[PDB]
Design a binder for this molecule. Sequence first.
Ligand code: FAD
Ligand code: FAD
Ligand code: NAD
Ligand code: NAD
Lengths: 37, 452, 452
Amino acid sequence: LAMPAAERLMQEKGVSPAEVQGTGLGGRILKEDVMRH
Amino acid sequence: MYDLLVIGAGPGGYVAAIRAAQLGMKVGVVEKEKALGGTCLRVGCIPSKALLETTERIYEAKKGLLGAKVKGVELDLPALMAHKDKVVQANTQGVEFLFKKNGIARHQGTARFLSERKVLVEETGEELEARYILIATGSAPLIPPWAQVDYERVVTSTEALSFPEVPKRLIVVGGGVIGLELGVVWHRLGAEVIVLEYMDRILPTMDLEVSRAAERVFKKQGLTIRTGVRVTAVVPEAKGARVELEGGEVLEADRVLVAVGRRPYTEGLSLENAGLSTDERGRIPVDEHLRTRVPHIYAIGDVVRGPMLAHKASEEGIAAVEHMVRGFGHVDYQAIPSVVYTHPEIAAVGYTEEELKAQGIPYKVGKFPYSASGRARAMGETEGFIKVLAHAKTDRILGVHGIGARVGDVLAEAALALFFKASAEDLGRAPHAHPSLSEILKEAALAAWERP
Amino acid sequence: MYDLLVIGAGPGGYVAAIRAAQLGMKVGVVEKEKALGGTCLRVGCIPSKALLETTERIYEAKKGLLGAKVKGVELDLPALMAHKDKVVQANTQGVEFLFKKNGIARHQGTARFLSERKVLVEETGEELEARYILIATGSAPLIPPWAQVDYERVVTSTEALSFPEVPKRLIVVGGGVIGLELGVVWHRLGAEVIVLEYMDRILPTMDLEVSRAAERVFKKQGLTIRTGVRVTAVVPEAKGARVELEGGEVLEADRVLVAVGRRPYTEGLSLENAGLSTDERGRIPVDEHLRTRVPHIYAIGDVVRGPMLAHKASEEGIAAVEHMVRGFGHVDYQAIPSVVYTHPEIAAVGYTEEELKAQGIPYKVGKFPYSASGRARAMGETEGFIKVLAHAKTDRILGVHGIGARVGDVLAEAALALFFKASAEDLGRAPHAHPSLSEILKEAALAAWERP
Ligand SMILES: Cc1cc2nc3c(=O)[nH]c(=O)nc-3n(C[C@H](O)[C@H](O)[C@H](O)COP(=O)(O)OP(=O)(O)OC[C@H]3O[C@@H](n4cnc5c(N)ncnc54)[C@H](O)[C@@H]3O)c2cc1C
Ligand SMILES: Cc1cc2nc3c(=O)[nH]c(=O)nc-3n(C[C@H](O)[C@H](O)[C@H](O)COP(=O)(O)OP(=O)(O)OC[C@H]3O[C@@H](n4cnc5c(N)ncnc54)[C@H](O)[C@@H]3O)c2cc1C
Ligand SMILES: NC(=O)c1ccc[n+]([C@@H]2O[C@H](COP(=O)([O-])OP(=O)(O)OC[C@H]3O[C@@H](n4cnc5c(N)ncnc54)[C@H](O)[C@@H]3O)[C@@H](O)[C@H]2O)c1
Ligand SMILES: NC(=O)c1ccc[n+]([C@@H]2O[C@H](COP(=O)([O-])OP(=O)(O)OC[C@H]3O[C@@H](n4cnc5c(N)ncnc54)[C@H](O)[C@@H]3O)[C@@H](O)[C@H]2O)c1
C-alpha cells in the first residue's frame, strides 16, 4: 500500500497505515506523510 | 475531417499520433521531410548515438584492452558511416510501419495555418481540417549572423555527423551537449579537437559539480576545452576556416562545428492566421495542459518551453492527446532524465544543487564514487560518481546527478524513483544486484538519507 | 562480550557487521580465511566479473568492430589475471578498511560452538561470547562422489578462474550460472567449450523462455551445449581428464569444470553444541525473522534457504541485525534480481511464468525485442528481449525477465518497481531517456499493461 520507508517509519512509531493519508503516486503513503501525522 | 491533425513527425508528433490512435482518434500527420522521425531520428539522437557507441569501442581498442595486445586498429570510415545510415534507415522505416499499423494518415509538405481550424499543405495544395491541431514543429540549429556557415567547412551538427574524412583539426564553438558529443566522436577518430565555450563551465543543463568533473575528464582524454571564450566570428577559407575570438586571437582548422544552441522552429507556419504568436525566444506559449491561447490547438516538444529532449517531446505529446480525449494529462518534468552520451556518460534528473540553492530548499547530499565500486573496478573504470540530493526534512529525492561509465543507464532507476516520489531511504533500501553499477546509486541514496 | 558475534565475513556477514555497528552494537567477526569478503569477493562474483568484462572486450575486438579493422589481437593471460587479482585485492582491502572505520573487531580462525552463547576460535584458542550470534558461513562447491576433483585438471569454479593457460578443450559439467559464465570466459579466449547439462534446459533460476533463448544464443556464439545428459564420472588423467556419460560415451578434455551446484557450508561449526542442526540439504532452518530455533542465534545467506546471491545474503544480514536491535526487519525476496553476466546478459526478478502457472495466478505478458530498440540498433545489438509479467486483474508487476546487452543493468529499474509494488502502467508511464536500453523495459511494461 505505502512506500517501504513509510512502513519502516510507521512500524517504529507504531503508526497505523489506515491513519496516514497517502499523497504518493496513486494510493501510496510516503514516509513524509507518516511524519506528517 | 480529422479528429487530430499533427504538424511535425518528430518524437513529439509521431508518438502523439500513435497515442491518439490508441485512444480512438482519426489522425493525420503533416511532415515536410521525406522521412518521418524528425530531428532525433534523421539528424539527431539516432545517428549521433550510432557514432558514439561505435567510436567508443574503436577508441578503447586503440588505447589498449586489459589482458591483450592489439597490433593495430585501422579506421574504416565508410563502414562506420554505413552502419549509422543503416540504423537511421531502420528507425525511420519503423515509424512508417507504426503509422500504417495504427491507421495514421500521412501528408508530405509544409503545413501552414489558413485559420484556427484549417491547414494548408503548401506543396500538394490540400486544405486539411481537424477538431484538434497539434503543433510539433521542433527546432533548428541556432546560427548567429557572425557564424558564416557554408555547410562544408563551417557546419552545423547535421554535417558533422557525415564528414567525408576525419578532420585534421575540428574546432567546436559551443560547449553544450551537441558540441561535446560530436567533438568526442571525432577526437576518438584522431582529430585534434578544440572546444570553445563562452561561459565559465560546459554542459549548462548539468549540475555544476558534474559539469566541472566532465570538463576535467574530457581534457584528460585529450580534448582542448577553453571556457570563458567568446567566439566573435567564423569564416570559411580556402580549405578550412578561421575562428576569431574576443580580444583578437585567431584560430584555424579544416572544419568548424557551430553548436551554440538550437531554436524553436516555426518558419512557414503562418501562426498569425490561427491567432498565435511566438515569444522572444521563438517558443509558442502554452498553458498547464499544453494548450496554446487557442483552446483546441496544442503545442509540444522543442517548439515550446522546457528541455529540448526527445522523450520530453514524446511525453508532452502523450499528455496533450490524453487531455484532448480525457480532459486530464500530466508530464512529470522532475523525473525527466538528461543524458550526455560520451564515455563516461553524464546525466541529470530533477533539480541541480544550483536550482535548490536558488529556491531556498534545504537539502542533504549523498555521494558515492565509481572508484569505490567493485563492478566499476572489475570493468577497469575508476572515474566518476553519482550524487543524490534529498530534502533535509522529508528525505524526498529532489535530484540525482552523475558522471561515469553508463551512468545514464544507472540513472534510469533514479528517474523511476523520482516518478514515484521516492525518498533517499526508499531507493537506498531497495535490492540492487551485486556487483553492478546500480549499487553506486544505491550507496549514494543511503548516504543522502543517513547524511548528518 | 560482544553485542553481536558474526561467523563468516562474506557479503552476508560483513554487511551485517557494518549495519550492526551503525546501530550501536559492538561487533566481533570470525573468519577462517586470511582475507575478508567471502566467496563473492575472494573466488566468486568479483574475480568472475573481472574476467567476464575484460574477455568480452577482447572477444569483440577479435570478432571485429563496426567501422574498423583490427589487424591482430594477442592474449596476455598473465596481464588478464593480474587485473583480476588487483581488483580482488582492492575489494578485500576495502572491507578491511570499512571494518576498522566502523570499529568492528576481527578474529582469524575457524569458529566452533562450545554452547549456545560461547564460540571457540580453534586456531587461536579464544573463547568469545555475545548477546546475539549470526551464522553466515556461506556455501561451498558441490562435489559428487563420482567427480574426482584434483583441483588442477578436474576443478571447481575457484581453479577455473585461474587456469595457467587457455585449455584447448574445456568441458563444463552443469549448465547453471557458474558453468555458463566460466565456460563463456574461456571460450572467448580460444577454448573449445562443451557444456553438459542433465536437465532439458540450462539456467534453472531463469524464466524458461529466457533459458531457452540463452541456450540458442550461446550455441550460436560457438559453445556446444548438450542438455538431457547425465555425467556419471569425471577422472583426472595425464594432462587432462575424461568424462563419462550415462550410456557409456566418454569425452576427453584438457580441463573439466564441475559446476553442478553449491551447498550450504557448516563444516567444523559444531552446531549440535548450540542445539542446532541442518536439514536434508544442509541448510540451517530459520523463521520469518531469520532466527534459528535458538532465538538469539540468527542465520543468513547461502547457509539458509533461498537464492544463493551476494545481495540476498547482504539484505538478510541487514534484516537480521535490524530485528536484533529494533524488533523488526524485512527482505523483499520478490524484488531481488538474479543476473548472469555473460554477453548478452540474462536476468530475472520476481516470479517466472512457470511459478505463476504453478500457483494458478492469472497474468498478462508484455514483451519487447532488442531488435525494435533504436539504442540497441545503434550499438549493433539486435538479439534479446525483455518480458514483463503483470497480474491480470490488478496490473501489479509480478516479474520481469530478459536476455540482451546489459539487460541486468536495465532490470535494476525493474527491481525498484517491484520493491515499490508498481503496476505495469506505473513503469510504462514513467519517463525514460531516448534513445536508451531502458526503453525496452518501458515498452514491455506498456505491452503488459495494455494486454487484453
Ligand atoms: C545532433 C543532435 C543530437 C541529439 N541527441 C539527443 C539525444 O541523445 N537525446 C535526446 O533526448 N535528444 C537529443 N537531441 C534533441 C532531440 O533531437 C529533440 O529534442 C527532438 O527531436 C525534439 O522532437 P520534436 O518532435 O519536438 O521536434 P523535431 O524532432 O525537430 O521534429 C519536428 C518535425 O517537424 C517538421 N516540420 C517543422 N515545421 C513544419 C511545417 N510547417 N510543416 C510540416 N512539417 C514541419 C520538421 O521537418 C521535423 O521533422 C539531439 C539533437 C541533435 C541536433
Ligand atoms: C564463481 C562464482 C561466481 C558468483 N557470482 C555471483 C554474482 O555475480 N552475483 C551474486 O549475487 N552472487 C554470485 N555468486 C554467489 C555469491 O558468491 C554468494 O551468494 C555469496 O558469497 C554468499 O555470501 P555469504 O555471506 O552467505 O557466504 P560466503 O561469501 O560464502 O561467505 C562465508 C564465509 O564464512 C567463512 N566461514 C565458513 N565457516 C566458518 C567457520 N566455522 N569459522 C569462520 N569462518 C567461517 C568462509 O571462509 C567465508 O569467507 C558467485 C559464486 C561463485 C562460486
Ligand atoms: N543528449 C542530449 O540529451 C542532447 C544532445 C544534443 C542536444 N540536446 C539539446 O539540444 C539543445 C541544443 O544543444 P546545443 O549543445 O547545440 O546548445 P547548448 O545550449 O546545449 O550549448 C550551447 C553552448 O554554446 C555556448 N555559446 C554560445 N555562444 C557562444 C560563443 N559566441 N562563443 C563560445 N560559446 C558560445 C553557450 O554558452 C552554451 O554553453 C539543448 O536544449 C540540449 O539540451 C540534448
Ligand atoms: N550471477 C549469479 O547470480 C550467480 C553466479 C554463480 C552462482 N550463483 C548461485 O550459486 C549457486 C550454484 O551455482 P551453480 O551454477 O554451480 O549450480 P546451479 O544450480 O546454478 O546449476 C547446476 C546445474 O548442474 C546440473 N547438473 C547436476 N548434476 C549433473 C550431472 N550429473 N550432469 C550434468 N549436469 C548436472 C543441474 O541440472 C543444474 O542445472 C546457485 O544457487 C546460483 O544461483 C549465482
